[PDB]
């Protein structure tokens, strides 16, 4: 299962690219460079909620949903595991 630790990075990266592709062209979109785009992913998948970056495009919100479903699920497994791996040492 600890291979999700990849599904995430796949998602995160896909989320980045698509988010920008999606967002640019919309006047006032702050998600228009690939780096921020990544932090946005990470941000989203974890759902830390700093609210520093988010989509405005009808479409960008879609990439958001995908990053949420895929990323939350995904990131959820990476933790489930890391929780176990600790239960052992202790």
């Amino acid at each position, epitope marked *: 299962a600890g291979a999700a630790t990849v599904l995430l990075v796949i998602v995160l990266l896909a989320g980045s*690219y698509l988010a*920008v*592709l999606a*967002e*640019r*062209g*919309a*006047p*006032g*979109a*702050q998600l*228009i*460079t*690939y*780096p921020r785009a990544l932090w946005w992913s990470v941000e989203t998948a974890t759902t830390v909620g700093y609210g520093d970056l988010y989509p405005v495009t009808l479409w960008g919100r879609c990439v958001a949903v995908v990053v949420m479903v895929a990323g939350i699920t995904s990131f959820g497994l990476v933790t489930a595991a890391l929780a176990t791996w600790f239960v052992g040492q202790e």
Partner: antibody
Amino acid sequence: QVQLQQPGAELVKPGASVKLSCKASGYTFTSDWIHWVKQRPGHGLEWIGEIIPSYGRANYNEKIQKKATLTADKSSSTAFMQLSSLTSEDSAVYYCARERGDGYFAVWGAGTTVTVSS
Amino acid sequence: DILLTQSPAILSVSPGERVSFSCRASQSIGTDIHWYQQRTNGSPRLLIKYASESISGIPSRFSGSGSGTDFTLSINSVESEDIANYYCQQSNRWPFTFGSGTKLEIKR
């Protein structure tokens, strides 16, 4: 070596249209955006539009009147800006630049001087 | 869309002196401001990126400062080769925009 090659000049009669070019070289990625900037003599730089060849999508400056249509050609690494129905107003130097999707234009073209005259 | 105010339009400085060009944003843009140099008949040239980050191939004479809505491009000990037009450009919100421009001018 020089990264963006643009034709030094292009003459055009009012109402006519020219398709400028910009051939790349050096490093290339799927995150690259090629931009076009208009500059009339004396005045400053004016963003016209942008395109992502590794996908083909393009967005244009909504303030100015749309007189262009961007296209790219993956294989030859060449971006094309089609300017239609020109007037004295459209005469100026047009630069193409490469943006690594991080917001700034690292390298620029020599620019193509364009004149709209009979 | 974001407005980049570059004023004064012309700057007159004495050789070797320090000069400062200022760029003001119509709204906070963090540090997503970039500087370009353009000499008579040349093409623009990236000088500073992200407000302060340097660039290779550019004199250590050049530096940047600021965040939010107020930015400054500096030159320590100006000189003939520095006579040009300086522009600021932002990538905070779409679509990118440019400053009106500021012509440096040395008095000899």
